[PDB]
Design a protein around this ligand. Structure first.
Ligand SMILES: *Cc1c(COP(=O)(O)O)cnc(C)c1O
Ligand SMILES: *Cc1c(COP(=O)(O)O)cnc(C)c1O
Lengths: 399, 399
């Protein structure tokens, strides 16, 4: 099933106006299928009567009912009841911290968190640690700028309960030895929260093969709607979790004496779902299933490598890129990041700078922020040339 | 100027296919402005480059940046920073229970909750009471089927801290005397959680005039997107609230020792927002503001009255409707509600039966469920005739 970059590119209506779009790691452009499924959803009754668009209404209902399974197929989850709808990776992780960890954490218990984590997979652990008297323990980087998994046997103690580890950094694009980390973690009776916001896009985790306890990601990074995300959990852990928000749909019986709940996933989904989000994400995954993602990722990484090798020929260049990622974090010594971002946009290159919600990682790397060009399968060789030329022009003006 | 039902109607692309749509209280049809704004948002880059669609991009940004202000104008809130984005009424209320009440409630404190509350404004209070050693005190109905605000001085004690009260029930359409209730509560130093998921649609609350502490509603009932809701709070209460989810965007400084946050509202909004939801809700509110809601609402109510008066001439009819509401909850003795739902749909009439997420209320009214026809300003006199005729034929076929 051969990947064809031009066919892929052709599905994105934003592209002609977008210029050279290298900001996909912050959020992805949307394929036509997502745009149209969403338009149809808001242009049709959600009731049981359809006087004139019945056929289309049935297709939307089918999209909605198949959504969990499409996520399950992405992750190789054992069944679609292990998929919980959230509003994003951030909510997913907060739910694990509050619904799984909090009722189990004892004062003195330890939560090991990688120094490479996005704030989404750090602040919730700081919060629950304060709530329970538990403590957060730093998992540092090795000399290769990856979380030092080989150090885990030294950091694990009888008090360790939780490991929080990103599948893939949104700064370096680095992927730690997740399989080995889980083995150490499970040897000590710990559960692992895997942040897959970037991994789900580039190399979606086989959660059965890796024996992942919890996995989170966001739809809007996966060519999909805003306001929608996923929490995968093993059935036994979802069953063990306390309820998240209270309200309709998650409850079974309610009285002024108390309440009982549905089982998972529904236990964890109070209120009207973001139905537009679920349908659009369903459409994105259904569209995406026509493409070989390994081939699509190799294309992206190749472009990032051509970009990195060309930029390294310019003086002052510094790269924070790991493992030939699609993500290319860099800066030029002596040049202000925001000046470079602005000039690049004016020359038609869309990317960004800043701290990328990763202050502790940037402090270890010894910088205040980085530029990041992220390449996606709708990018081209021309896009690389345009990035390089735009950087040359920026440097002329700023240096 | 005078409300024109035909002009209101012409803006809803779903209306021809929808047949006789009488389920707006569950979810509302959308005007073209919402469909189009959403289409545009998903069809353009959100990055910093636009080769030619700068005007369309700037309009989307203007909708997004004005959205809080448009909510404020609907509620007469004093400023747009008292508006917090959530995923729905349900999240809003859970946020108040967890971030305002939980850190303050002492063992033995009391939370007064009306028997008419939707589960969204009951289950979170059961939950936080259990977490804090507080107790929930039921506010019963009076003879008019409204929460008995005149009874509050008797139920309030020195330990009362919170009043949870719906502005308008999704079953009876009944609106209690909110001003009196709030006066009684504030006299005793209590804060009030007002569920406006229906009220916001029919009788949008003037939160300054009523001196409401917290007000919640959902976008999808207000002619808007799914996956978006509002929490209004007095600025001092938003400021006093603990953070909600932890992560990016809500934080400012972060280390492995701890963190600081943004100020409200951003303090309370972790992660990537549901940008499509905010823009679409903004578009809904901008469109809605062209209409006198009192006139549009009196039109809906008048249709519900014509329906009720007609149905009451059929033997076995029973109504649960209060105060000439736009919502008509009813029953026919000896006939299964679900059978009637199904046959009315064959007649092109869309409504629903069930428990409406209000078990304690139904128990108090002495029934296990109800039919509910809800009228909106895109409904017509001929919709009423069609409903009444459909009911006659359903009864003939079922009885
Ligand atoms: C619909 C409704 C809610 C819940 O709204 P969500 O969007 O599902 O969170 C709460 N209260 C009342 C009275 C409602 O009608
Ligand atoms: C984008 C991202 C997140 C947060 O996703 P939201 O949709 O904003 O909640 C978390 N972790 C990583 C590694 C990310 O790239």
């Amino acid at each position: 099933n051969v990947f064809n970059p031009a066919q892929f590119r052709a599905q994105f209506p934003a592209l002609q106006d977008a210029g050279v779009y290298l900001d996909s790691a912050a959020t992805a452009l949307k394929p036509e299928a997502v745009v149209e499924a969403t338009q149809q959803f808001y242009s049709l009754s959600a009731g049981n009567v359809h006087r004139s668009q019945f056929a289309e209404a049935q297709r939307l209902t089918a999209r909605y009912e198949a959504a969990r399974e499409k996520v399950a197929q992405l992750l190789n989850a054992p069944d679609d009841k292990t998929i919980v709808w959230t509003r994003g990776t951030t909510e997913s992780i907060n739910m694990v911290a509050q619904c799984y960890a909090r009722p189990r954490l004892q004062p003195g218990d330890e939560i090991i968190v990688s120094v490479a984590e996005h704030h989404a997979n750090l602040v919730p652990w700081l919060m629950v640690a304060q709530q329970t008297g538990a403590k957060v323990v730093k998992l540092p980087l090795n000399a290769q700028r990856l979380p030092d998994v080989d150090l885990l046997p030294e950091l694990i103690t009888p008090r360790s309960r939780i490991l929080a580890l990103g599948q893939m950094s949104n700064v370096t694009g680095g992927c730690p030895d997740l399989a080995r980390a889980i083995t150490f973690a499970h040897s000590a009776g710990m559960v692992v929260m895997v942040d897959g916001a970037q991994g789900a896009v580039h190399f979606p985790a086989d959660v059965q093969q890796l024996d992942i306890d919890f996995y989170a990601f966001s739809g809007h990074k996966l060519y999909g709607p805003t306001g929608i995300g996923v929490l995968y959990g093993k059935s036994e852990l979802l069953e063990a979790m306390s309820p998240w928000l209270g309200g309709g749909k998650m409850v079974h019986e309610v009285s002024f004496d108390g309440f009982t709940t549905q089982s998972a996933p529904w236990k964890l989904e109070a209120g009207t779902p973001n139905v537009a989000g679920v349908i659009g994400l369903s459409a994105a995954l259904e569209w995406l299933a026509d493409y070989d993602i390994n081939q699509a990722e190799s294309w992206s990484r190749s472009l990032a490598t051509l970009a990195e090798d060309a930029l390294a020929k310019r003086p002052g260049f510094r790269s924070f890129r790991c493992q030939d990622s699609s993500l290319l974090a860099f800066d030029f010594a002596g040049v202000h990041h925001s000046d470079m971002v602005t000039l690049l946009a004016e020359y038609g290159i869309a990317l960004r700078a800043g701290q990328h919600c990763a202050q502790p990682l940037l402090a270890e790397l010894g910088v205040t922020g980085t530029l990041r060009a992220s390449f996606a399968p709708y990018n081209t060789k021309s896009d690389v040339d345009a990035l390089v030329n735009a950087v040359d022009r920026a440097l002329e003006l700023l240096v």
